[PDB]
């Protein structure tokens, strides 16, 4: 998912 959570 390119829109998966990218954050820590």
């Amino acid at each position, epitope marked *: 998912n*390119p*829109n*998966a*959570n990218p954050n820590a």
Partner: antibody, heavy 121, light 109 residues
């Protein structure tokens, strides 16, 4: 007050390369995903790429995959976009955009002022 | 890519009016949809996400509705600061982000 400042724009011939950088201030940079978003002469907005907080994952727009590389140096709170094989369709204002941090929504709470890239012979 | 289309391209209104603008997706984006405001020479500012949730600090006169392929942004009683361009943006799972082309809210005279 979070601040994002882009640099590296200019005029370049098609096929050449250019490196953009974005310096983040007053932000725990390493906690957040970061994006590049560009705005075309027609005022259209186009998402360009995203990079994970720790650089362990990246995704790209179909338009730029294979030509652009997103990276970050969390030691210097700096985001980069390496642009190679530039096309005239890449002419735009480039903004670094912070991921707002909510797991389920890819939306941008803070934006830089943008850096202009003109691709022309 | 999913195509986002906004209607109308330009909308004329007066201070105090209620206005609604529409955003349509070429396939369902569930409620993975946000709206932004942009004025000349400035970067966009986030207004609404997940179709209907107001972002921090956004005035209560803004609201959003819709799901699937059809979404609306409503401004209940326009203020001078609201004349601007508005964009929608999806972030549907497994689909790369795209934006609508913008709707400009101009002053009627």
């Amino acid at each position: 007050q979070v601040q994002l400042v882009e640099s590296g724009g200019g005029v370049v011939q098609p096929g050449r390369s250019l490196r953009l950088s974005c310096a983040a201030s007053r932000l725990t940079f390493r906690n957040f995903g970061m994006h590049w978003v560009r705005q075309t002469p027609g005022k259209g907005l186009e998402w360009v790429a995203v990079i994970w907080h720790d650089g362990s994952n990246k995704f790209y727009a179909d338009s730029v995959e294979g030509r652009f590389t997103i990276s970050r140096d969390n030691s210097k709170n700096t985001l980069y976009l390496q642009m190679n094989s530039l096309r005239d369709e890449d002419t735009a204002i480039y903004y670094c955009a912070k991921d707002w941090g909510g797991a389920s929504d890819r939306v941008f709470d803070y934006w830089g002022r943008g850096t202009l890239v003109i691709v022309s012979s | 890519d999913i195509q986002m289309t906004q209607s109308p391209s330009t909308l004329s209104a007066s201070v105090g009016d209620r206005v609604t603008i529409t955003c349509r997706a070429s396939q369902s984006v569930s409620t993975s949809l946000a709206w932004y405001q942009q004025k000349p020479g400035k970067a966009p500012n986030l207004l609404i996400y997940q179709a209907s949730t107001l972002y921090r600090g956004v005035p209560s006169r803004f609201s959003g509705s819709g799901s699937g392929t059809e979404f609306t942004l409503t401004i209940g009683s326009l203020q001078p600061d609201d004349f601007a361009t508005y964009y929608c943006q999806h972030y549907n799972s497994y689909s790369r982000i795209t934006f609508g082309q913008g709707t400009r809210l101009e002053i009627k005279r």
